[PDB]
Amino acid sequence: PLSETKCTLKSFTVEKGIYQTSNFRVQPTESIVRFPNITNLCPFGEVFN
Amino acid sequence: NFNFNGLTGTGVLTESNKKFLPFQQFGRDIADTTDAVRDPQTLEILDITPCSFGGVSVITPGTNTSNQVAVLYQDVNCTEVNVFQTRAGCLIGAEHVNNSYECDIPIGAGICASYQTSQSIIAYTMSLGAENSVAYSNNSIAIPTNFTISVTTEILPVSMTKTS
Amino acid sequence: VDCTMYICGDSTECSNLLLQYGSFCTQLNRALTGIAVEQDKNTQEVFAQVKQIYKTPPIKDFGGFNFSQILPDPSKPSKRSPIEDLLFNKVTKFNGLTVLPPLLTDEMIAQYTSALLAGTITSGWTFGAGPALQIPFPMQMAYRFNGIGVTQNVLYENQKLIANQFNSAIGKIQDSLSSTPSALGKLQDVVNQNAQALNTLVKQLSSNFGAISSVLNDILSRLDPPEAEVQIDRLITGRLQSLQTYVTQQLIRAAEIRASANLAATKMSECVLGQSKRVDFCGKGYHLMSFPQSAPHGVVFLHVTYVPAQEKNFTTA
Amino acid sequence: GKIQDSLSSTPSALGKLQDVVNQNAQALNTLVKQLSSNFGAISSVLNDILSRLDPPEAEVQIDRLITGRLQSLQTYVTQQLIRAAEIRASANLAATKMSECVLGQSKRVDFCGKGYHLMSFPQSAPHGVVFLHVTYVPAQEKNFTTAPAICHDGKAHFPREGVFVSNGTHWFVTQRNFYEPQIITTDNTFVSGNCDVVIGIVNNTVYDPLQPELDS
Ligand SMILES: *[C@@H]1O[C@H](CO)[C@@H](O[C@@H]2O[C@H](CO)[C@@H](O[C@@H]3O[C@H](CO)[C@@H](O)[C@H](O)[C@@H]3O)[C@H](O)[C@H]2NC(C)=O)[C@H](O)[C@H]1NC(C)=O
Ligand SMILES: *[C@@H]1O[C@H](CO)[C@@H](O)[C@H](O)[C@H]1NC(C)=O
Ligand SMILES: *[C@@H]1O[C@H](CO)[C@@H](O)[C@H](O)[C@H]1NC(C)=O
Ligand SMILES: *[C@@H]1O[C@H](CO)[C@@H](O)[C@H](O)[C@H]1NC(C)=O
Ligand SMILES: *[C@@H]1O[C@H](CO)[C@@H](O)[C@H](O)[C@H]1NC(C)=O
Ligand SMILES: *[C@@H]1O[C@H](CO)[C@@H](O)[C@H](O)[C@H]1NC(C)=O
Ligand SMILES: *[C@@H]1O[C@H](CO)[C@@H](O)[C@H](O)[C@H]1NC(C)=O
Ligand SMILES: *[C@@H]1O[C@H](CO)[C@@H](O)[C@H](O)[C@H]1NC(C)=O
Ligand SMILES: *[C@@H]1O[C@H](CO)[C@@H](O)[C@H](O)[C@H]1NC(C)=O
Ligand SMILES: *[C@@H]1O[C@H](CO)[C@@H](O)[C@H](O)[C@H]1NC(C)=O
Ligand SMILES: *[C@@H]1O[C@H](CO)[C@@H](O)[C@H](O)[C@H]1NC(C)=O
Ligand SMILES: *[C@@H]1O[C@H](CO)[C@@H](O)[C@H](O)[C@H]1NC(C)=O
Numbered sequence: 001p002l003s004e005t006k007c008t009l010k011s012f013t014v015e016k017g018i019y020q021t022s023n024f025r026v027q028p029t030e031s032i033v034r035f036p037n038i039t040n041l042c043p044f045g046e047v048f049n
Numbered sequence: 050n051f052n053f054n055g056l057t058g059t060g061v062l063t064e065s066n067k068k069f070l071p072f073q074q075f076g077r078d079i080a081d082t083t084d085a086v087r088d089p090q091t092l093e094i095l096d097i098t099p100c101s102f103g104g105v106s107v108i109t110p111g112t113n114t115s116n117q118v119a120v121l122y123q124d125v126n127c128t129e130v131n132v133f134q135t136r137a138g139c140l141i142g143a144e145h146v147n148n149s150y151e152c153d154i155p156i157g158a159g160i161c162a163s164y165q166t167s168q169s170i171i172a173y174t175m176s177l178g179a180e181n182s183v184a185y186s187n188n189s190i191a192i193p194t195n196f197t198i199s200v201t202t203e204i205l206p207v208s209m210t211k212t213s
Numbered sequence: 214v215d216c217t218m219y220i221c222g223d224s225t226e227c228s229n230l231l232l233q234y235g236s237f238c239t240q241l242n243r244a245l246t247g248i249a250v251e252q253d254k255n256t257q258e259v260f261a262q263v264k265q266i267y268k269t270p271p272i273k274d275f276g277g278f279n280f281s282q283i284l285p286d287p288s289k290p291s292k293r294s295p296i297e298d299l300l301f302n303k304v305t306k307f308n309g310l311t312v313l314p315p316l317l318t319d320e321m322i323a324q325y326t327s328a329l330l331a332g333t334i335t336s337g338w339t340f341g342a343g344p345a346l347q348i349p350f351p352m353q354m355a356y357r358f359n360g361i362g363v364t365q366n367v368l369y370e371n372q373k374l375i376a377n378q379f380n381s382a383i384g385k386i387q388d389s390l391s392s393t394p395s396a397l398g399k400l401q402d403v404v405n406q407n408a409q410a411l412n413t414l415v416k417q418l419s420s421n422f423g424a425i426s427s428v429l430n431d432i433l434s435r436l437d438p439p440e441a442e443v444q445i446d447r448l449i450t451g452r453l454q455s456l457q458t459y460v461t462q463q464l465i466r467a468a469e470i471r472a473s474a475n476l477a478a479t480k481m482s483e484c485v486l487g488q489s490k491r492v493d494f495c496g497k498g499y500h501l502m503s504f505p506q507s508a509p510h511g512v513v514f515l516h517v518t519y520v521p522a523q524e525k526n527f528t529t530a
Numbered sequence: 531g532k533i534q535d536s537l538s539s540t541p542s543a544l545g546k547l548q549d550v551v552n553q554n555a556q557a558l559n560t561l562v563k564q565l566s567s568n569f570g571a572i573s574s575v576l577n578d579i580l581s582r583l584d585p586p587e588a589e590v591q592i593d594r595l596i597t598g599r600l601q602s603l604q605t606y607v608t609q610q611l612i613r614a615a616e617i618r619a620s621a622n623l624a625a626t627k628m629s630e631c632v633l634g635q636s637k638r639v640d641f642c643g644k645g646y647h648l649m650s651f652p653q654s655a656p657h658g659v660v661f662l663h664v665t666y667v668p669a670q671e672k673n674f675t676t677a678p679a680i681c682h683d684g685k686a687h688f689p690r691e692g693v694f695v696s697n698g699t700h701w702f703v704t705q706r707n708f709y710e711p712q713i714i715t716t717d718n719t720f721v722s723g724n725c726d727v728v729i730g731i732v733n734n735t736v737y738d739p740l741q742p743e744l745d746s
Contacts, residue, residue, distance in 0.1 A: 001120045005107040014112045018154050018162070020246070022105040023215055024122050026129050028050040028059045028223070035054055036089040057430050059223055080415040082307055099307045102218070124311060137314050155253070158314035159321060177324055181265040183335040183347045187274060188730065190676040191336075191346035192695060193668030194709035200533050201643035201665065204546045205624040206658040209617050210554050212610070234598070235567030236560045240605070262640070276729065342645050343668040351729070352678055352693065356706070365688050366722035369678050372729055446570055457605065464612050472619070479641075487639030 051097075053086045060097040062086075067094045101125045103138060108154055110164035119143040119170045121156060133172055135160045140172055149176035214414075214459070216241050218309030220452040224429050226438070227445050237453060241460050248467045253316040255474035259512055260317070260325040260505075262481055267331035267345060276351035277376030280334060282383045283504050283515065285327045293323050293507075296383075296515075299390050300508040303397055304404065308418060310411060319507065326505045326512075329485055333502065341486030354501070360488045361499040361519055379517065386515060400511045406466065414459045422451030477512050481505060484514060533662055547658045553613065561606045569598025624659045628652060631663060646707075672709060677701075679725075680714065680734035686727075687719035687736050694734075701734045715739055 004021040005014050050059045056075055067076060067085050076085035076094070085096045103123040110117075119142030122130050127139040134140075136158035143162050152161035152175035161175040184191075216238030221227030231238065269284060285292045293301070301319070306312065317325070332340035337353040339346040348356075351372055355365040368375060390396045419427045424447040426432050432444050484495035484503035495503050498518030506513045537543045568574045571594045572583070579591050631642035631650035642650055645665030653660045674695035679686045692705045694714070702711030703718045712718060715737045725731055 001105075001107040001118045002109060002112070002116055005109060005118070006112075012112075014109055016109065016111040016114075016154065016164075018106050018108045018121070018156060020104045020106045023102065023218070024105045024125070024130070025102040025218075026100040028100065031050040031052075033052045034088065034090065035052075057428070057434075078307075080412045081419055082415065102215075102306075102309070103311060104215075123313070124306065152316075155316045157316055159316075159318045175321075177261075177321055177328075178263070178265045180268070181345070182268045182270065183331070183340075183345050184673070185270050185335040185347050185349075186272075187276065187349045187351075188675055188677065190348045190352065190674055190693060190695065191344075191671045192674055192693075192704065192709045193343070193346065193671045193707060195668075195670040196708065197667050197669045198648070199643075199645055199665055199667050201663045202533060202537065202543070203627070203643060203661045203663060204544055204655065204658065205627070205661075206547050206550045206617055206620045207624055208621065208657050209550065209610075209614060210657070212554070212558065230570075233568045233570055235564050235569075237602075237605070240560055244609075338639065339668070341639050342665075344671055346668070346671055349676065349678075349730075352676065355678060364720075364722070365678075366686075366720075369686075369688070369728045370723050461608055461612075464609075468612060468615060471616075475619075479638075482640035483638050490637065 051086075054089045056083065056086060058083065058097075060099050062095040062097060065094040065096040067096070069094050101129045106138075108140070108143065108156065108162045108170065110154075110170070115164060115168075117142075117164075117170060119162060119172070123157075135172070143170045143172040146171045146173050149174055151176055151178070214241070214245055214456065215309035215311070216453075216456055219418075219456060220449055221429070222308060224433065226433065226442070227429055227449065230442060230445055231449055231453075234449070234453065237457075241456055244460050244464060248463055249313055251467060251471060255471060256315060256317050256322065258478045259474055259481060260322055260329075260507075262478070262486060263325065263328045263332060263340065265345070266324060266328045267335065267340065268327070269331045269334055275334065276349065277373060277380075278350055278354075279376075279380040279383070280330070282387055283330060283506065284334075285323065291320055291323065292327070296387060296390065296513075297323060297326075297506050297508070299387065300397065300506060300513055303390065304400055304509045308415060310415065319509070322507045326507045329481070329505050333485060333504065338487045341482070357488055357501040358519070360490075361501065363519065382517070383515070397508070397513075400508055403470065403510055410459060410462060410466075414455060417452065417455040420451060420455075422447055424448050424451075473511075480514060481512070484516060544655065544660075547655055550617065550657055557606060557609060557613070561602060564599065564602040567598060567602075569594055571595045571598070620658075627661055628659070631661060666707075668707065677730055677732040677734075679728045679731040680719070680736065681725040681731050682734065682736040684724050685721045686723050686725055686731055687714070687716075687721055687734075689714075690718055690720050692718075694732075701732070713737055 001021065002014070005019050006012060008019060008021045051062065054074065065085055069076065069087055074087050075083055078084040083097055085094050087094055103125050106121040106123060108119040108121055119140060121138045121140050123138040125139055127134045130139050130141065131144065132139060132141050133143055133145045135156065137156050137160055140156065150163065150173060153163035155161050156172065159174050160172055162170060162172045165171055217228055217231060221231050273281070282296055283294050285294055289298065332345055334350060335347055336345040337348050337356065351368065354375070355368045358368045359365050421427050424432065424444045429445065429448065432441050436444065480495065483489045483491070484500065485505055488502065489495045489500045494500070496516030496518050498520040500516065500518055502517045504515040506515065566574045571579065571591045573579055576592065576595065579588055583591065627642065627650070630636045630638070631647065632652055635649065636642045636647045643663030643665050645667040648664045648666055650664065651662045653662065674697065676696070677694050679688050680694060680701065689703045692703050695702050695704055695711065697711070701714060703714045704711045714734065717739065719736060
């Protein structure tokens with residue numbers, strides 16, 4: 001964190017205080033593709049069977 | 050990242066208490082941002098709260114005194130990230146001390162930080178000044194007998210550099 | 214507002230395209246940070262005009278003057294006066310737009326106005342200039358009357374009448390704020406304008422600005438890079454222009470609020486910590502005293518003034 | 531002398547002016563850096579665009595740069611107009627302070643520094659003005675018992691200037707801002723009403739300067 005502050009302030013000396021140095025996010029873990037239930041399946045039976 | 054029947058986007062799905070009508074497939078917030086969805090296979094309503102985020106701020110005394118710092122993750126919990134949960138965020142690296150003092154590094158929501166004797170970063174609810182009471186009574190007046198002349202400095206800008 | 218999350222939220226390709234615009238977003242974040250800091254400076258300048266926290270004694274015998282409607286109510290959960298309670302009860306993070314806590318919370322601001330009230334009540338104007346020197350309230354008012362060209366004796370001979378008129382006038386303030394919806398329009402307008410600015414900014418995410426879709430993922434999920442980059446640049450230009458509009462409007466509104474905060478700080482210094490002789494600065498009439506009360510995103514002053522009411526025609530020379 | 535030591539010792543004393551310089555410098559530094567941005571163009575340097583591409587497409591890239599750099603100037607100028615409004619407000623305050631604190635003695639509380647204003651001195655400073663405000667601060671105080679009035683013959687005497695104080699055994703009248711007890715006489719007080727109205731009137735003796743002269 002201190003090096004991040006130095007880089008944000010473009011200085012090797014950081015004055016006393018609170019400095020905003022980055023932004024935290026919580027990264028998406030799983031790609032869930034959930035969709036409707038499967039019904040009205042196409043009459044391939046007749047053609048094939 | 051979720052894709053509920055072509056509706057798309059990242060968030061945390063949690064069990065809701067909302068009651069959609071039988072035909073409505075996704076709840077929309079006041080400013081047209083999706084707030085809830087109907088899961089298409091189990092017809093239950095899930096709220097979508099966006100994934101936690103916030104700024105990361107570094108609380109430090111000067112590099113003239115110490116290279117020890119505390120990090121505030123603003124406006125999040127101390128689970129997603131000597132950890133002190135404050136209204137302003139999750140403060141990591143500062144110790145919590147109950148006795149109040151004058152605010153030195155403001156953090157927010159009443160919380161301030163300072164470097165004190167360990168000789169470590171602490172956080173506390175700020176004091177607003179020493180408490181006092183004026184010894185009021187209906188027949189008692191305090192009158193100065195001596196005085197000082199003080200000089201204070203008020204510094205004001207007057208002009209900018211005349212850039213053209 | 215996090216410019217990169219707002220424009221290009223959770224999209225690496227869009228973020229890479231945003232980086233071709235250089236300093237625009239860091240500049241916008243800097244301007245919004247400057248405003249956010251200024252709002253705490255504004256509150257500090259208005260309310261932190263007292264170094265010490267003063268308290269009134271448990272004895273409330275102030276010569277008949279009833280301050281119980283402006284002094285903190287110990288019984289309630291957050292040590293506020295009833296008028297403060299009316300003010301608070303009468304005023305009504307997604308896409309990267311977040312709201313920071315103020316540095317001084319409502320309880321601390323109530324404590325500062327309590328300190329200012331206890332100072333005014335128990336020491337008059339002396340807590341402002343120097344050490345807070347106790348003086349009985351009727352004697353403080355005798356000075357306040359003498360300060361407007363009315364001999365001291367007018368208070369003392371009419372003390373009971375004056376104290377009753379003061380107590381009645383404060384009760385009328387309680388009714389006036391309680392019953393009229395529009396008394397606090399000045400702070401509700403500020404809340405409403407910020408809410409409208411942010412609802413507009415969020416709604417701007419749904420605009421196409423000429424792109425095939427307002428949804429970044431639907432462009433990325435449909436189109437191959439060389440042309441999706443064109444549509445995304447269209448969305449970036451529109452959304453960046455939306456943020457620039459928002460930030461400019463916020464800077465101008467912040468300048469307005471700064472002017473109000475500077476006026477409020479002047480009024481607390483000259484009306485509350487003293488007895489102003491500036492006409493109509495501290496309400497109509499001749500200023501005697503004024504009292505701060507906190508209110509959400511602002512300050513409410515009760516200005517106590519002397520108004521002549523009955524007159525007679527005399528011949529003069 | 532303390533002002534000289536205070537201003538010298540802490541370098542941050544003039545932050546209010548230094549920030550203005552810094553902001554203007556940042557305002558220009560960003561603007562200059564904005565020349566290096568592409569804004570979607572194939573190169574941020576105009577001469578390579580003209581040297582590489584034929585007119586029908588080089589003009590498109592150049593229009594892209596024109597929009598980006600013009601919007602950058604519009605941002606700079608808007609920020610300068612707002613900042614100039616801030617500085618104008620400061621200059622108007624400084625002119626008011628010069629008028630009222632330096633050319634006069636302000637009675638506006640805390641306008642001309644904490645305490646009770648006595649005088650002020652301007653000093654120049656780069657891009658601004660520094661005022662040294664000389665104020666009277668009461669510093670040591672004592673607890674006296676007081677009264678709104680005194681009864682002498684059944685008439686109520688109220689102080690003409692100042693307040694009544696008691697050191698425990700004797701009553702004095704004194705100027706409100708500095709302990710300076712005087713003997714209560716008819717030249718210090720005025721008479722209004724009588725003893726049966728004033729809440730808190732205390733019995734006392736008012737000296738009449740004429741009587742000793744008439745006997746003498
Ligand atoms: C034409 O008819 C044949 C047979 O009648 C179909 O083949 C059958 O397809 C089903 C698909 O579900 C198979 O069912 C399977 O059963 C096992 C256990 O019984 C289960 O574990 C599997 O998951 C699956 O459900 C069935 O075994 C299979 N039978 C044969 C003989 O192939 C065929 O699908 C029909 N034509 C078309 C176009 O579907
Ligand atoms: C889809 O199948 C599940 C069985 O796991 C069933 O419970 C559900 O009700 C089906 N979908 C709908 C829309 O009913
Ligand atoms: C801070 O820096 C100054 C020189 O810039 C140095 O003299 C001083 O000792 C430093 N502070 C401390 C606490 O050492
Ligand atoms: C989130 O923080 C709140 C307090 O702010 C706490 O009650 C809750 O347990 C926290 N949840 C998690 C998952 O950390
Ligand atoms: C005060 O600090 C002590 C640590 O010395 C701690 O045990 C105690 O719980 C704190 N009090 C409160 C109210 O948090
Ligand atoms: C007033 O204070 C000054 C120093 O500030 C001191 O020298 C002087 O003796 C004091 N006078 C009285 C009467 O106490
Ligand atoms: C007036 O003061 C008395 C105490 O003397 C208090 O009981 C009463 O509640 C006050 N008036 C109001 C409206 O609260
Ligand atoms: C004074 O005299 C005028 C006559 O022009 C009259 O109108 C007015 O009412 C009088 N004022 C009072 C207080 O009687
Ligand atoms: C006046 O008396 C009160 C208590 O009666 C005391 O607290 C206060 O310190 C006294 N004033 C001074 C100046 O000592
Ligand atoms: C002295 O005070 C008493 C009240 O106890 C009052 O009755 C009396 O009249 C006063 N003396 C004079 C001379 O007014
Ligand atoms: C009060 O002042 C008088 C001066 O006339 C003096 O005689 C007396 O001793 C003083 N008493 C006290 C307690 O200071
Ligand atoms: C002051 O209050 C006391 C009670 O604390 C009372 O006995 C006395 O009469 C009051 N005096 C004045 C002048 O109000």
